RNA sequence: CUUGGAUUUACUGAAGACUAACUACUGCGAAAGCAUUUACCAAGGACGUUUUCAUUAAUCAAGAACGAAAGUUAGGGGAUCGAAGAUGAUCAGAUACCGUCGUAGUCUUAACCAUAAACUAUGCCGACUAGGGAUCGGUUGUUGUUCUUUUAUUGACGCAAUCGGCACCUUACGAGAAAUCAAAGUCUUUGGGUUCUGGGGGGAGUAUGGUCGCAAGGCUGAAACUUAAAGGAAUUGACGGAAG
């Protein structure tokens, strides 16, 4: 896939990782 | 040109060079003897003067500074020293 | 259903005496009725007519004069000067590449308190023996030319009445003086007063207007 | 690889050039990169310059010209054949085409 | 001599306006558009429709007393194209061939001295 | 959207933006960037100099200033365009292209953010090596030229030199895998000074820790595992809803 969209997908996936870890702080 | 006299450049081509690009650098400026029209009193003025020089006798401006050589006022005659 | 042209009355447009051919043309309006007079709804109209028509000569074909009607005398409309402008094609034919365009404007009032904006335009002139492709003036020269334009338009408008100024615009008196005054700055060509705008008018003086119509 | 030594534009000794919109599609294109054509056309087609001259109330009235400067993006210009694909060696030639 | 109107011809790429006023432009004498002469939207701006539109304008002009007109051709202008539409050339030729007399001709397309942002977006309209 | 007068026409007014044409293988700036006039404020390069000081310099971990657009916070403005959204088409489907509206945004003031194909994909300083014509700034010598004003001390132009720039054309001594390059040359005949970066392709600019940020995110930054190629430039062909 396009590198720009591959980058956007990972940013959205990193965003999810941060929110999930925050549950237990 | 493979063979050329670098120590004795042609004086014609030597005069077209920049003042720092000759074999030995030498200024192209000079000093002048300025006669104001009013009187006759030798006043030494630099050719590239940055000052509005006035002669001692009469308070008349001899030259006005410019970007390069100073511009002598009307009625003022100069002789290179 | 009604054919609205049966109720139209024709009027004649008269230019001031500053021009030559004072018979500009004809206009029409709804005939004067009880509710609305034809006179009051007809004054204030602006007519844009080419200066070549007002003077006969074709040398003024590229300038067009705005005439504002401000008095009606029977079937005659007494118009006054409302503005000056160039034709679009004339201005586009002057703006070439490889040359400098310099413009200036100034707001100035006449002797009779007519507030005007006068727009001057000029271009750098290519010398007859010139070899290089472009003819550009340094920005310092353009500022000096622009300063010279402004003080000449200010002088040649504020020192005369609006009627006298109209007699100045027709032979390009101001344009010829700007070109002469800027000779020692840079050679210029096509020096024109390309536009005049009325911003504010003094209190209406019918006697002053009537003197401009015979 | 590099196709043009000029990068397809005319920006040297400059950082940024403000854009222009293609006449045909309104695409933002840098002013130096846009394909610009200055056109001076007769306002009346040569077929109609006669009958319109007869209908004129003015003896010896010159018909005004139509002045326009057109800006095209690369896609607008190539599609409309304003510019064409040239060979690798013919690309370097930047003198105006010998047509007029 | 003659009685002049002003033939304000607005020729866009979607239509053609043939609008004749007086000298001031405050009085409308005849306004016939190319869309009143055809039943297809695609040729409202056709040269043929503009010629028919101009002929109806000239006939209306004659019965009111307008014997000559000045021409003020314009394109859409503004942020859009400055070149006149295909119907503007035909409406001008039709008026001259209809017995109306022609005075000054001028292009009065509105041209900005900059301008506002033009529609289509940064990448233009992709077709 | 329109006989409740749309679109069109003239005059008048108000709002915000934006600075057309002139505008260029032209200018300025450290870069990002900078294009209406005038005034003011403080800067700057180059040039000229028989002025002055005398090594005060070059490049620079750490540490700083600035840093397009988008984005964030709070006021003000909100014309136009216009993410989102809504809608008419097209389509097998299109919540896509196309059309009509449209909110954030677009503009500005106070703060943040610190990233771009932020590109010349080419670090900075110094020296040398080849021809040519243009051009911008300064200076210096000179015309069957136009003009001040009637001439000079007018300005423009013309012809020569020169210093600095933005570039360009030819050649290849030379370099390179080639494309190409006056530097990407003076590199196995290998050493002028110095900073930064890379070590097959992925995993991955990911995880984790730290730190900065209001957030978005920025900076720093692995490993397990997986893989024989991935890639660069060019050649012949084939194909193209590319041109002739
Ligand atoms: Mg390619
Ligand atoms: Mg950039
Ligand atoms: Mg296409
Ligand atoms: Mg410039
Ligand atoms: Mg620079
Ligand atoms: Mg650091
Ligand atoms: Mg920013
Ligand atoms: Mg706000
Ligand atoms: Mg808004
Ligand atoms: Mg749909
Ligand atoms: Mg949508
Ligand atoms: Mg859309
Ligand atoms: Mg919209
Ligand atoms: Mg904001
Ligand atoms: Mg980066
Ligand atoms: Mg680039
Ligand atoms: Mg880089
Ligand atoms: Mg560095
Ligand atoms: Mg070097
Ligand atoms: Mg020079
Ligand atoms: Mg070799
Ligand atoms: Mg080369
Ligand atoms: Mg190079
Ligand atoms: Mg690796
Ligand atoms: Mg390849
Ligand atoms: Zn003396
Ligand atoms: Zn495009």
UniProtKB/TrEMBL annotation, chain A:
Comp. bias intervals (Basic residues): 1-25
Query: Could you give the subunit structure recorded for this chain?
Result: Component of the large ribosomal subunit.
Q: Which family does it belong to?
A: Belongs to the eukaryotic ribosomal protein eS32 family.
For this entry, the protein name equals 60S ribosomal protein L41
Tell me what organism the protein belongs to. Candidozyma haemuli
Q: Which residues of the full protein are shown?
A: 1 to 25 of 258
């Amino acid at each position: 896939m396009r590198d720009k969209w591959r980058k956007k997908r990972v940013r959205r996936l990193k965003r999810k990782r941060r929110k999930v870890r925050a549950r237990s702080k | 040109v493979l063979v050329q006299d670098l120590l004795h450049p042609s004086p014609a081509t030597e005069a077209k060079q920049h003042k720092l690009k000759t074999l030995v650098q030498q200024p192209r400026s000079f000093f002048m003897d300025v006669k104001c029209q009013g009187c006759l009193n030798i006043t030494t003025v630099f050719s590239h003067a940055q000052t509005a020089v006035t002669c001692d006798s009469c308070s008349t401006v001899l030259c006005t500074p410019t970007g390069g050589k100073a511009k002598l006022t009307e009625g003022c005659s100069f002789r290179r020293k | 259903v009604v054919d609205p042209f049966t109720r139209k009355d024709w009027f004649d447009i008269k230019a001031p005496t500053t021009f030559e051919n004072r018979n500009v043309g004809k206009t029409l309006i709804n005939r004067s009725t009880g509710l609305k007079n034809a006179a009051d709804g007809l004054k204030g109209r602006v007519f844009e007519v080419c200066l070549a028509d007002l003077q006969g000569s074709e040398d003024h074909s590229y300038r067009k004069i705005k005439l504002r009607v401000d008095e009606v005398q029977g079937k005659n409309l007494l118009t006054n000067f409302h503005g000056l402008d160039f034709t679009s094609d004339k201005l586009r034919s002057l703006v070439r590449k490889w040359q400098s365009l310099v413009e200036a404007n100034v707001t100035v009032k006449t002797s009779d308190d007519y507030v005007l904006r006068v727009f001057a335009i000029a271009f750098t002139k290519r010398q007859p023996n010139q070899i290089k492709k472009t003819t550009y003036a340094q920005s310092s020269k353009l500022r000096e030319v622009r300063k010279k334009m402004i003080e000449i338009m200010q002088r040649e408008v504020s020192n005369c009445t609006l009627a006298q100024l109209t007699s100045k615009l027709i032979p390009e008196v101001i344009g010829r003086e700007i070109e002469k005054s800027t000779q020692t700055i840079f050679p210029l060509q096509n020096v024109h007063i390309r536009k005049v705008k009325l911003l504010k008018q003094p209190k209406f003086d019918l006697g002053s207007l009537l003197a401009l119509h015979g | 690889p590099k196709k043009r030594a000029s990068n397809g534009r005319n920006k040297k000794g400059r950082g940024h050039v403000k854009p222009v919109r293609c006449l045909n599609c309104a695409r933002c294109v840098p002013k130096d990169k846009a394909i610009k054509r200055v056109t001076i056309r007769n306002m009346v087609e040569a077929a109609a310059v006669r009958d319109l001259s007869e209908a004129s109330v003015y003896a010896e009235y010159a018909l005004p010209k139509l002045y326009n400067k057109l800006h095209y993006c690369v896609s607008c210009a190539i599609h409309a054949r304003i510019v064409r694909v040239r060979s690798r060696t013919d690309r370097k030639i930047r003198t105006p085409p010998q047509r007029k | 001599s003659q009685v002049f109107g002003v033939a304000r011809i607005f020729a866009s790429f979607n239509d053609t306006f043939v609008h004749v006023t007086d000298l001031s432009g405050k009085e409308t004498i005849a306004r016939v558009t190319g869309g009143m002469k055809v039943k297809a939207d695609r040729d409202e701006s056709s040269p043929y429709a503009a010629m028919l539109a101009a002929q109806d304008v000239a006939a209306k002009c004659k019965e009111v007393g307008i014997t000559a007109v000045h021409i003020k051709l314009r394109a859409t202008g503004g942020t859009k194209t400055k070149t006149p539409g295909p119907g503007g050339q035909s409406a001008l030729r039709a008026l001259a061939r209809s017995g109306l007399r022609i005075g000054r001709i001028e292009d009065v397309t509105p041209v900005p001295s900059x301008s506002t942002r033009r529609k289509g977006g940064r990448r233009g309209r992709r077709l």
